[model samples]
Target: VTVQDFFRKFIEFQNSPNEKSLQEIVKLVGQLDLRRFNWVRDVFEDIHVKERGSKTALIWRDINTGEEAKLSYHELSLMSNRVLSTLRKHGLKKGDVVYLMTKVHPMHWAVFLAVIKGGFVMVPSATNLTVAEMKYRFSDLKPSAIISDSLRASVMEEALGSLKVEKFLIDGKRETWNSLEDESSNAEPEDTRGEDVIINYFTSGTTGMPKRVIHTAVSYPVGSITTASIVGVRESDLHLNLSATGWAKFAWSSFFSPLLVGATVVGINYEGKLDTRRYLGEVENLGVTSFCAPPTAWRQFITLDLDQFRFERLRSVVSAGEPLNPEVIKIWKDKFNLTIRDFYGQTETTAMVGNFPFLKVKPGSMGKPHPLYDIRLLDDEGKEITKPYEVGHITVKLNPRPIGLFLGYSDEKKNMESFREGYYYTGDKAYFDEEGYFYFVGRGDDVIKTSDYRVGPFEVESALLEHPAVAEAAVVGVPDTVRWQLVKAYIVLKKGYMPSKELAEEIREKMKTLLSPYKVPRIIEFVDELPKTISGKIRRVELRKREEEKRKKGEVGQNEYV
Candidate 1:
């Protein structure tokens, strides 16, 4: 079947029984007429025109208290009209840059669409920015104004404090700030040029300050390919995207994928820690067709009773945020009759490589490069790794650029290094097997460089997880004057395993049997749990920070460790 057929059928099943859905779903064939697939613009236009009602989209949620809310595509169309009209009134016209700093709310989605509809340039920045950081973004991006909810009117005003900038802050609380509640042109149609700019997010640069990654109106819409590729989004799919608006994942699923492929995107504004069972119960009752969550969600999901959730309607499950282990994949395969397809990309670009319809699902691989991307795994010298089973830095060739590749860094120096190579250098390191499947290693900086050996922390952690006593592990390279550095394993043990000195030796012995001695974590420290970022990524940098602190305090005891 063709891409057009794929979308039509997928959206139809959302309101139909999918078992007799389509035989082509099981077919490994997909023919793409280039012209038709490029109907990416039609996704937005169609919802406004043809599918304005009839549940074109919906986001129902209970944020603080249990007061549920609903928004159909019709309601959103009118809301976006007001947002666009207001933006125009404030001189925030098409292609003009503006930074977004807000949590998940109906306004977040409406404002996002407005920026696209208004032909304005958007930069999705984490709202948690300090006043100093906000100053940098404001000056660097040269945005004409700052837009936020009425709640942020004071904080943003204080931070941005009387710059030459104008402001059209929306009052979601229905109080003070220019209440957008009653604002709108409500014209029959408002057309936006596809080439007009859409977004420019602050790219996460591990070693240096973040870069401003830009996108055109059609950039995010391309994420639909990656989403449809993995989730096999059905017509009636109710996709729960765990990411918030400030992050790129929000655009990937919440706006791009589910919407373009004709599925309903449901969001839950969750606070506190994410409880797996609570999320699972919601998915089951919601009859969600596909669910995309981070790998950490799967870690907790395995601990629950899988039989409790009816995943019959749920055909596909996807993992993002980080590399997932195969154990997590096996659990879903057995229990939910679903496969965890790993796709690779970051905030800077759209999904560059993924498991498409034709590819076989390899357990540990991130699948092959997608057709839209010219991918390369390059050695340290930046030469492509051509031989089978070779390791190198993952990159995308400049030609046939991924649509979501940012225009450039907002800052000059930051732009130079990232755009220096002909290819966009994704700091991620990975190796391709003989089967041409990419297996992710840790990040370049986090990958332990000891002597001539380039060791990945994941390999060490994956081996450590094999032991029943081992619950979780994080590996880092510690200073060892002789070997330059040594692998140190910070671990969390299962409750039953007593953390005596003997158990540590047994773990070392088990690791020795599992891997070469050079690959073994030479030093071991038992901790209650590993430190993590807000997104649940193990913060190896924080661990390194603590190590530096200990050294300054003269607390570096080394007799038992490397």
Candidate 2:
């Protein structure tokens, strides 16, 4: 089967089941002939062309208010047409950048489709961007317009300060803001090429301000076709992607991937703190077929009564952002009879490596590379490695560039450092075993160096998670003049265990046999929880920086010198 053939069978199943193996699926998708044109036209318009009123596009509910809504293919097409008209009425032209700061309102899908259809570049931002961050974005992107809800409108107004950019509000009336609801829903699609820059995501590195990661119109919508396949998205599947509105994963698993396969996306919009059991209840209530979430959400979900809550309709479950502990995977598989597969990728790319549904389950491994991606593991010298268990940098070969990979960073210097010597180097590191399965190590900067030895934080963190008392852990290299850096662990303990010198020593003793002597963390600190970014990545840079400050102040504890 060809790539087009796979797509035909997938869409057929939504109105419609294929029982093909992983090898058979890949063998079909591996033969890709790019005969298509635009991603939007192919997905939204093409599906609308085939069957307009029958296919459900989205199933949405505001869990806070218990308000529910649904949209079909024809309805969304017309709605997006109106949004495109609204964008144009505001004097926004093709290639004009618009900062999107709205919440997960039902209107978001139409606006997103509008952005794609109109050929405008979208800068999807967090609704809660600080004054400083907003100003930086304003200075960097110089967006022609800003769109938001009333809650974020004020924030955007404050950030705009003296700028003359137009502001449009999605919900409620606001002075000096154009109303989005009044737009005409009968407009036509604007001209756009597959190679045109459609989306720009601002990604902050371990150090420095956020950098722009640009994606072509096809890169995301088309690149995500493979991602949808990896997650086993079939027609008629209801996927609930658990991610905040701002991040890249939300766009990937939440929006485009599900829609690409004609699957209905289910989202629960709540005001504050999530109730795990209630969330699980919705899964059973809505009959969600496939679900995708980050490791952090899964960690919290696992704490609930797994035996009591049943999601019989739920079939496929996947996790990304960070590698999940094998224990978490084992428990889910044992209780729910479903394996939580781990996917590996970056903001610079779509899902490059993942545990495809048809493949053998490797508890801790990140599975095989996707067929579209030409992946290779490289050593410090930039030479490819063949030996098993040899840690190396994950890189994409540029000879035949992958579809979903970002074009380049906004800063040329960063681009030069990253996309060097014919390979687009993903800063993350990992190693492959003899069986061709890949295991994530850690970010290049997060690796701990101690007296001629380099240790991946993931290995130590994974070892710590196996201990009964440990709930969560993050490892970072604390600066030490003698050893170059000391491996330190910040841990969250279970209910009964308290932080103490004796407990820390006991953990150290237990880990000695689980890990190499040099790989064991010398400094251990107990914390309520680990620091994570809004997107749920462990903030190792912040941890290391705090330790550096403590060392400079001569406030290092003698007990920390284990």
Candidate 3:
């Protein structure tokens, strides 16, 4: 079957009342030839926009200015075609790399579509990147052109000092950069194959410098059909995904997943601190039907008086990027009568495990493996673990690699370590229950070994979150002479709570009741916030380094408690 046929069948199945299992959807996905799947010519322009030309494709809102812009599929398509024509006029050709950095704007989507349709490999970067960070990526990717707003053009020029790269500004005017706003003519989409490289994302590095992750035409575009299925996004739904523009989750939910099913993608542009009340009010007013955000955002949402908000149109809610604590999930369910679905995947792949709409929702579990992947667990001995609740390495069968999986990292040495023994080792760890529900442990390197037991930091962190005083927590193994390593927790207190020895003792006592004796933190430290990556993941490696430095100097932290 052709790509158009596959999308028609998938859309029809989604809109129909007929019940079908995820396996059936997987079967349909397998029928499409990856080699022939071009997201622009085949899926977006040929099938999606042609059928839903008048439908809303994007809704961009500015929180500070109270401004909003809604663009239809036909309008967005025409805008992208003009962007393609403008780039071509500037001497850009297919297979060139275009580095893009811009705030949340309607033009961001236009430029993204233009890059994909023009057959140029895209390198997406966060707008807040420092000059050094920009230089690192610029030197590595060697992009032929850059697309940025005028606000960030100065930084881009500073980073590209000696490199000769064409610059295209999206928002305002810059001295030497070409403006994309005045481009009026349209260009035809390029003929690109599914196996061609399309996007390169920098990993949210927790341990070291970020590495470039490559994605092909089909890997994210066609592969996001699985993500759309997990999100339960439909043609009539308005889906809101709260992810930074540079992250892979933005591509997964904000761009491909919603647009793949013809759902309207919503973008909220805000500066400085996030106003949760205003954000939630907009969701209700916009009549958003489906919602997705990271666990961090979900945690922040629960801190408010959620009872005041009535999400009458909201049906599907999901969280990813980190394990959602059961405490937060239960609170949302108790308040709204809606269970927040938790799904799991990495920058390297699409949704591998998720709580599908058809499955029973497990509060803390990552849910069942997607039928598109063959997920397995292996112990340190390189043997498969079949027993329930035994933590092991999460690996995917690579014999017939999942179409959603990334091609490989740019560094061949890293690829050698990741893809080996006929399986792609995910570097993360998890276990399955007897009923086939998978639960996240911690990263392989983040697991704490204390006394004679191995403790996953996620469990300890989850236990800490159950306490009323604890707002966020990070657990790590502090080196000890007698105990091999000691479980230590760095905690951020909630509002109205102050850091005190008495509060720390109370938190430890609470953990004693919730976790095993060995898993309870031996040392606790109160802090304003935990160190995190730009993408909002806890940087346990940074905490571990501090602990190691203190040990070397035979010192203890000022806020630390025994």
User: Candidate 2, 340: how far from true, in Å?
Assistant: 0.8
Q: Between which residue pairs do clashes occur in model 3?
A: none
Q: Stretches of candidate 1 above 4 Å error?
A: 1-41, 150-154, 164-176, 186-195, 445-562
Across 283-397, the per-residue lDDT of candidate 1 in tens digits comes to 7777777788766667668878888877768766787766667888898889877888777677767777666544677886778775556778889878999886777888878
**Which candidate would rank higher by lDDT, 2 or 3?**
3
Q: Which stretches of candidate 3 lie over 4 Å from their true place?
A: 16-19, 182-186, 204-207, 446-556, 559-562
Best-fitting candidate, measured by lDDT?
A: 3
Query: Order of candidates by lDDT, top first?
Result: 3, 2, 1
**CA error at residue 484 for candidate 2, angstroms:** 24
Task: Score each candidate by Cα lDDT.
Answer: 0.66, 0.77, 0.81
**What TM-score quantifies how close candidate 3 is to the native fold?**
0.81
The predictions' CA RMSDs to the true structure, in order, are 12.1, 11.0, 10.5
* Higher-TM-score candidate of 1 and 3: 3
Angstrom error at residue 410, model 2: 0.5
Cα lDDT tens digits for candidate 3, 1-562: 7768878778766664223655676787777676755687787888778989898899999989888999999999888888888888888998999899988889999988888888889998877666656777877779799888767888888888877778888765736678765565757777788888889987633343457899988888887877877777888889998877777888998999888888889998887666878988888899899999877678778989887998998988998867777988899998888888999887889998998877788878989888788888888866889899899999999878888899999888778888887899888898889998999876766656543244567767877889998899888888664344688999999899887888888898888766656678988999887888899999888998887787789886545565
- Provide the lowest-lDDT 10-residue window in model 2: 14-23
Provide the lDDT at 367 for model 3.
Answer: 92
TM-score of each candidate structure, all chains considered together = 0.71, 0.78, 0.81
